[PDB]
Amino acid sequence: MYQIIRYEGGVYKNNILKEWIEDVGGFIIQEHVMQLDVYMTIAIPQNEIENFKEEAKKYKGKIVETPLAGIEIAIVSPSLSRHHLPHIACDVSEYVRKFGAKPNMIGLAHGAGKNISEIREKEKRLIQEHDIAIYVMGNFESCILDKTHLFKVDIPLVVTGGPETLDIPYTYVGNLGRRAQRLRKGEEIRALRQMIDEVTKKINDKRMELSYDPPIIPPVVLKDEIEKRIDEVRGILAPMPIVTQLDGLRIKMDYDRNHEEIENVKIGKYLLKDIAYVTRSEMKNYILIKLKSTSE
Amino acid sequence: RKEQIVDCRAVMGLGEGGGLAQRGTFAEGLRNDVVVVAMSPGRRHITKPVCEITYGIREAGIQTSVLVLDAGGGIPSDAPQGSLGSTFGLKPEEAKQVNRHKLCVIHFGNVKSHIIYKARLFLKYVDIPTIIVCQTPVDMEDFAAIGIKTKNVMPLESKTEGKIVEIITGVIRGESAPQKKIDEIIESIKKHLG
Amino acid sequence: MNVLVNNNPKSGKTLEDVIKDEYYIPGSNIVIIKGTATVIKEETKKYLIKTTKGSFVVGITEENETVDFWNKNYKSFEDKSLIWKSISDVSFGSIEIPLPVSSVKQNFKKWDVVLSVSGLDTSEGNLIFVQRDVLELYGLENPKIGILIGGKRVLKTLTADDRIISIEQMRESKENIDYEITTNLNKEIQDTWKIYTYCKAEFDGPPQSTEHALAILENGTLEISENTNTYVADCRLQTLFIDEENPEDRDRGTITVRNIGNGVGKVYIYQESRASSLSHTVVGKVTDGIEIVDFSNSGHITVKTNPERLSVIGKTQKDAKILFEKHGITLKMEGNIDEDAIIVEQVPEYTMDILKSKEVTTKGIEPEKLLYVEIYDKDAPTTSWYFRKVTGLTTKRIGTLKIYFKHDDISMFERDWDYSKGLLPENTPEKSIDSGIIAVTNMVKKYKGYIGVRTSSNDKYGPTGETFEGTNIVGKVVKNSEILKSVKQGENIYILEVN
After folding, report:
1. For B15, left (φ over 0), alpha (ψ -120 to 50), or beta?
2. In angstroms, rounded to a whole number, what is the distance separating the alpha carbons of residues C353 and C330?
3. Helix, strand, or coil here: C424?
4. Within 13 Å and on the Cβ side, how many CA atoms surround C367?
5. CA C128, C129, C133 angle in degrees (round to 5)?
6. Nearest residue on chain A to B6, alpha-carbon basis
7. How far A82 CA lies from chain B's nearest CA (Å)?
8. In chain C, which among 128-167 make CB contacts under 8 A with chain A?
9. Which of C180, C198, C197, C190 is nearest to C3 (CA)?
10. Taking a C-beta distance cutoff of 8 angstroms, is the pair C11, C20 a contact?
11. Which of A244, A102, A292 is nearest to B9 (CA)?
12. Out of A15, A213, A221, closest to residue C275 by CB
């Protein structure tokens, strides 16, 4: 119902556009002003899409269709060292961000090596808390083939590596190995686009399974209601104070101090504890909300 | 050896063939130990001198956050006869994001008179010990000459609540920092952190 | 001939005939609805089924060509019994599948609709409803057509004996509503045509915002200044402030007043169920007859408000007496008691407060104490709009001016430092200003927005002590005078526009 897009325009008369979005019932998920231009990730009803396009072209704005601006992605690098972090991993994260998704760098404690690589249970669960996980592996076929135990999570998976084709029992995108330069060549861009297409296909499939039994309330409007009710959300210093997942939300506030307040929030006529699974997150002791379906 | 998870920024980078970071953005490293402050997301600061220090600290086992200042270029408005070219400043949200870390590492340029006043304005709202990484040879004391708290050379009338805890010279903007500078920074962070 | 009108059928061919009875202020629009279309469209990307073990929900995902096959060949797979439920998942059919059975095996995921041509024999193509993620196991270019999720258990419980029988789909259906918008009267009606004339508005909200909405709908017509797919808005009072928050759901046919921003004071009527907003103050609801709002995109709509606006400021005392006794409200008198005494102030002045308190205190004024003014709206539009906003003539019939400073011939009135923004020099004097001229100082001078009037004439200074280039004439005092010389500082004088 609420298609999420990105608006790129200027800060001049942007408040009037925000007023129009509020009037038509949309929500401003993200706002950032660089110097004189403002980027807004907005979720508006589908019946007002053409109206918002007309309104945007009145302010000389730009509408960019973001197919991933409702999910958060766990990008799993073997380590945060100079080998993977400052290049390739940031390129993957930023390319994911370019399509609206909210990434999180997951640097494994013991993810490096061939036979000495291992993944902890806490890291496993932290990865599972996301919607989809992208693995940035090396550039040797034998090393990757002898590293399959790393990709053991019941989450949609896309594995990236050096060799063009791999024989792992997962989705694989080649020609994205461990490098040391910024990804700017045509082949590297094509491989990034291929990875984006694979994650988009997996996300659309998961969206269809979710649409088989829709949740009682959409995550975006639930986030809006939480912001309207909870008055501590504007004091959050995290990058994204409330993350919009596929079938829930991630509230970046202390669980021990604020779970009772979060649960006792009345949306429509239900209490939040009876329609969502509020639980502590492995992510810095934050609050994770998983929405129930209409079946229960 | 422990897992290190970084809260990536919520906004994308500078175009297609440009930088990966964005001005006025913050990337939390969960456990807040060190925050690396970059004046701008441009090639003069990002990934050549800043992400190298970031991965050096992350290799040392210390979680790192990287904050790109909204207005990090220029000199503060409180500089003698005002500022010129551009105005340097620190936002209250930026100050709060910095102040939840145990230590701060900030990268400065080459002109001393710019660096001293930029550090004074930065420490007017930052209350944690910071390390100044610059190119020019600057002395611990010229900061105290304008009223900046300094570990070795205190001022009589301190105009800042933050302590310049170490000054490291020889790091050039836009150029790969050698392993020796990274080792010096890591040793200073370790011996003024725990 | 026999047509259905509202809820009480009429027949009169011409609109006039049927709308004669229907209450309607002339000038609004007429909404006709014709009927419903009920177009049935179904694509069933997700397909249904009616097996002898229940009904699962398949859903095409991988286009490949198995989708192209399924498209119409699922009807050939209809009434096909389960062929096998072995390690190779549950399979059905098996019908002819001409899809080139490429030996090349493919990996499949748990519960993924697969049309693997079993045995690589076209006519033995099996509908293998995958159960467990089978890797390189089946031939064909790519058996994967879709993914099974809904009714997962059905295909699991499904035994060989059970067939898929009626492979259903999704019966996808839609609805279209005919609408035409009119404002003619002399037209022929064929038969069984429905006409709506007016909408009913129920008001329940904070007193100031509800009074604003009532003032908008005092004449019974609501202008449509902006229209979207979710609301229609009125912009008569777009620069009037209110400070009241009523943030609840903006449901179907909800009336809200925007209380902050560029459009503060706009009145919205929502045609769609939307979320609550902190910038919208709900003042009430439209009870019945929403379709006139739904199908109107511009123009006028006749609105009837259930709580009558109880604000008698332009009336005589007997009119207030009879109107308030007909509402069963206790009354007491304050100022001029004469039956013709003109009411100037009423306590409380809000309809909601009056109804919740069931008592009104009415203040009258002496016939010679009321000041008569004429406002130049064509000459100084912005200045006249500011004067109406500050004196309150935008809402009531009698405005109040407070004396701010006084000296002999000059009497300056108070200003509002909220409406004096676009006070560009509009009507600047060219010759000496004559007596009894109301003027407002524009943004040129330091004391912008202050209103004043003097009882004499000078060739140098305006009625506010500023030069002519800093003064714009908004209006004049026409009839009542010699009361500006006998009013102290801080006292309020009351004005009445006589055009």
Report:
1. left
2. 13
3. coil
4. 6
5. 95
6. A105
7. 6
8. 135, 147, 149-150
9. C190
10. no
11. A102
12. A221
Distance CA A267, CA C346 (A): 41
Residue B80's identity, in one-letter code, is P
- The two three-digit tokens of residue B185, written as one number: 């920074």
Six-digit token pair at C18? Answer: 């049927």
Q: Who's near A121: CB < 8 A, 6+ residues apart?
A: none
Residue of B nearest to A76 (CA): B5
Q: How far apart are CA C242 and CA C250, in angstroms?
A: 19
Cβ contacts of residue C58 below 8 Å, gap of 6+? C46, C47, C48, C49, C113, C129, C146, C147, C148, C150
Find tokens 């140098």 and name the residue: C460
Query: For residue B146, what are the contacts with CB-CB under 8 A and spacing of at least 6?
Result: B116, B117, B120, B159
φ, ψ (nearest 5 deg) of residue C202? -110, 125
Angle (CA) B56-B57-B61 rounded to 5° is 115
User: Nearest 10 degrees: CA dihedral of A99, A102, A103, A104?
Assistant: 180
Residue B159, sorted as left (phi over 0), alpha (psi -120 to 50) or beta, turns out to be alpha
Distance separating alpha carbons of residues C345 and C311, to the nearest angstrom = 9
Instruction: Tell me the resolution in Å.
Output: 2.6
Smallest Cα distance from C257 to chain A, Å = 11
User: Does residue A28 sit at the B interface (CB-CB below 8 Å)?
Assistant: no
Task: Name which of A25, A33, A34, A28 is nearest A5 in CA terms.
Answer: A28
Q: What are the backbone dihedrals phi and psi of residue C405, each rounded to the nearest 5 degrees, phi first?
A: -150, 145
For residue C433, give every residue at least 6 positions away whose Cβ sits within 8 Å of its Cβ, in sequence order, or none.
Answer: C439, C454, C457, C458, C459, C462, C463, C468, C473
